[PDB]
Ligand binder design. Structure first.
Ligand code: HEM
Ligand code: HEM
Ligand SMILES: Cc1cc(N)nc(CCc2cccc([C@@H](CN)Cc3cc(C)cc(N)n3)n2)c1
Ligand SMILES: Cc1cc(N)nc(CCc2cccc([C@@H](CN)Cc3cc(C)cc(N)n3)n2)c1
Ligand SMILES: C[C@H](O)[C@H](O)[C@H]1CNc2nc(N)[nH]c(=O)c2N1
Ligand SMILES: C[C@H](O)[C@H](O)[C@H]1CNc2nc(N)[nH]c(=O)c2N1
Ligand SMILES: [Zn+2]
Lengths: 407, 411
């Protein structure tokens, strides 16, 4: 019931108790571990609200005070009469920060308390949503000195009036299948790019076309907005030694901003809650560039490097991988756009885990997502046992809107 | 119930029914996943179901389920259990069970090979000097002058738990570690404690950086005894780099035969507490883990130094650069000397083909993603992108505590 996690590199053992407050389920049972699976009414809401308000009032050292009792009282009143309730600003901010704190898959959580929360609960149209998002983009971008931020649109009501950003991230590149049979741009966004076209977007048909927003206000049909080109900071990718690298014509955007997830706070559901931080280099260099179903550039880079591609055992893929990743980091740093390397980020997370064990009694972590996609065992997180469990407030995955929406 | 796993690179979906035959527990619950935790005396009572379940699996795999032979064998084991409180496996049963323990080993990326396992039956063994002889024979057979063959040697099963056979070494071949007075380590830091036990038991330590350890062998619950593996039986590979000629001057070498000797084989409720087994190396085990873990030989700094990489900021990725060169060297060295080794691209690719094969013919393949994905270059290997189901099937290999923690000394 009280659980140990060991670091195998340093022998440091931590004791986890925080898991006993876990509310949601994992996917796993005593018979099967699902740790590597990507995706494993009035009555229900009152308990959820209470659980949340209890933790909030505890956090501000006023647990069981008159102000605590009065608020629980007031929310109970409100649910009974209205069937939902509204969070105080203070609660909303607490909820959002804690949803990030509880993100078991996020290596960057050392930062979690420095989160700029934009309350867009007064938003009523898609045009207002576009306005909110442009402001989030410009604030978070901060001319390259990135600042963490979330923009929180109105909560779900009867579920027929959902706000949704149809995009998966605020900024992403279009994918188009070719007569050639191949794929131009990012293969991950073909379906969403077609949707956009279908609704009327005129696509430039290049390899790195920033997609438009498709925004859904109040359960309405989504509409299209181009983010002002000048708000989208991009970085040309060059290598500090290989002059030919720039000739590949690679670029990536500075701002990673997740926009398809659901924020749950005290039982309330915020279905449009775009959030953003800054990149760890491997995200772009390893995943976006090298995944076979992504820009899949390994083969071209290796050839330009004149490596032996006759046999897997020359480790030509591995060699090219490191260089691509050196180039990503070098380009971002040269243009003064915030980026973190995987050594620095994982080191930060081990420190954050120590902190969270010490001050909170644990830190849910998902080892499968936390360990970087290159050079695993040379980062400290590889050797750190992690317990994965689900706390609330949280961010949750939700179905892609085009499968839900009725037009 | 059916469970699907998806591959996110290929969209290939697979259906698992095998997990329905899983008996043992995982460590996980609906409230906590223990998937990255490294480590998460039987009565008749519990033995006969375990024997029956095994013999059912065996007779099925020979198309003899429900046969006169199958039934006569149940009756025979049953009587043996109720009369002697244990039972003996037939030779073909021991074979079957040792291969299946491997097939079912969810942390094993090399399982495409599982049906080619040479089984050496050492159940007539009685002494530690006997053990030494069976282990020499295993190593010679397995090494095969660099053309490695998979093998296992299976000493007598546990009886009352006071008469255990055990190999105290964690692998048959491993290098000594000496913790120096200035607090530095000479040799392999992983093996200090054991090297100190060997020493106390009487070993004369050469005390260099690659001393092959003695075997410490316990037969029949007796105090363990030391033996030196004949050096001529210990194949080693000097490490050099195809392009970097200073790489040889690092003085690195490694042994060709990975041979695990501290695990427990369970077959039909019987416990084989000494069952050393050997395969061949995947290059990253040496080049990534054994050379570059901070708690092991830890050569990243010296290698990057000699490569004159910019080491003032981690964001030069100097560690990643040196890491790749070291691994190129290990593969180059082994191949040059004609000693079997597999790279992590080839091994993970083979594994994915094995895993899909298993889903078709067997209804699943329990796999532990945390261990299967290689410790470098994770996402450019197909296994990274493969969803996996981890569950526990028997026959199986299990961890046991190191014997110096539990052994009752005779004197
Ligand atoms: C400040 C810099 C940050 C860094 C360096 C960072 C790092 C990461 C990385 C590398 C991942 C894995 C993503 C992937 O492989 O696709 C991740 C996942 C995630 N992070 Fe962050 N993070 C940051 C900020 C944030 C912020 C601001 C939030 C929300 C307020 C957040 C919530 C999450 C969530 C929910 C996931 C997993 C989502 C999913 O399952 O797809 N992180 N983090
Ligand atoms: C034939 C070549 C083989 C290759 C390339 C191979 C590959 C591997 C690798 C790389 C690991 C993980 C190593 C580590 O990080 O500790 C492993 C784990 C393991 N393999 Fe193999 N394997 C092979 C043969 C065998 C054989 C012959 C057996 C047994 C009969 C076996 C049973 C296991 C077991 C039980 C584990 C997990 C051990 C643990 O939890 O510590 N493997 N395999
Ligand atoms: C199928 C699927 C499920 C699931 N839960 N997540 C995905 C990937 C979508 C996603 C979610 C969160 C974060 C990311 C990162 C992709 N490299 C982007 C990112 C976001 C943030 C906020 C910070 C950061 N460094 N990087 N991607 C896909
Ligand atoms: C602390 C700890 C726990 C635990 N369950 N296992 C270990 C390592 C023991 C072990 C077991 C199986 C395999 C290995 C490999 C280490 N590189 C050795 C190996 C053995 C075999 C038979 C083949 C192969 N390629 N490699 N190590 C350590
Ligand atoms: C199937 C496996 O769970 C999937 O490839 C995961 C593995 N680990 C990951 N880790 C991170 N950070 N991001 C990912 O997308 C993935 N994908
Ligand atoms: C804590 C963590 O589970 C531990 O470092 C594991 C991670 N994955 C591994 N994977 C393999 N093949 N071998 C290992 O020793 C480990 N170590
Ligand atoms: Zn699990």
């Amino acid at each position: 019931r009280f659980l140990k996690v060991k670091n195998w590199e340093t022998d440091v053992v931590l004791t986890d108790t925080l898991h006993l407050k876990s509310t949601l389920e994992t996917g796993c049972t005593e018979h099967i571990c699902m740790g590597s699976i990507m995706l494993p009414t009035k009555d229900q809401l009152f308990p959820l609200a209470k659980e949340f308000l209890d933790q909030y009032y505890s956090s501000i050292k006023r647990f069981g005070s008159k102000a605590h009792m009065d608020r629980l009282e007031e929310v109970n009143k409100e649910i009974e009469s209205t069937s939902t309730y509204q969070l105080k600003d203070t609660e909303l901010i607490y909820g959002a920060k804690h949803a990030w704190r509880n993100a078991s898959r996020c290596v960057g959580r050392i930062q979690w308390s420095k989160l700029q929360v934009f309350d867009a609960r007064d938003c009523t149209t898609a045009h207002g949503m576009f306005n909110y998002i442009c402001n989030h983009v410009k604030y978070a971008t901060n001319k390259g000195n990135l600042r963490s931020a979330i923009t929180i649109f109105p909560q779900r009501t009867d579920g027929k009036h959902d706000f949704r950003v149809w995009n998966s991230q605020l900024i992403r590149y279009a994918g188009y299948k070719q007569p050639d049979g191949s794929t131009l741009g990012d293969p991950a966004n073909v379906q969403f790019t077609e949707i956009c076209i279908q609704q009327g977007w005129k696509a430039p048909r290049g390899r790195f076309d920033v997609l438009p927003l498709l925004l859904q206000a109040n359960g309405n049909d989504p509409e299209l907005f181009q983010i002002p080109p000048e708000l989208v900071l991009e970085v040309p990718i060059r290598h500090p030694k290989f002059d030919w690298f720039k000739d590949l014509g690679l670029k990536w955007y500075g701002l990673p901003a997740v926009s398809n997830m659901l924020l749950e706070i005290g039982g309330l559901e915020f279905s449009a809650c775009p959030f953003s931080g800054w990149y760890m280099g491997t995200e772009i260099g390893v995943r976006d560039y090298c995944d076979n179903s992504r820009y899949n550039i390994l083969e071209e880079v290796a050839k330009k490097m004149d490596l032996d591609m006759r046999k897997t055992s020359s480790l030509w893929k591995d060699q090219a991988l490191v260089e691509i990743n050196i180039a990503v980091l070098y380009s971002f740093q040269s243009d003064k756009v915030t980026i973190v390397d995987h050594h620095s980020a994982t080191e930060s997370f081990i420190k954050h885990m120590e902190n969270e064990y010490r001050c909170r009694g644990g830190c849910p972590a998902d080892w499968v997502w936390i360990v970087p996609p290159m050079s695993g065992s040379i980062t400290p997180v590889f050797h750190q046992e992690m317990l994965n469990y689900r706390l609330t407030p949280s961010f949750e995955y939700q179905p892609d809107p085009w499968n839900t929406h009725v037009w």
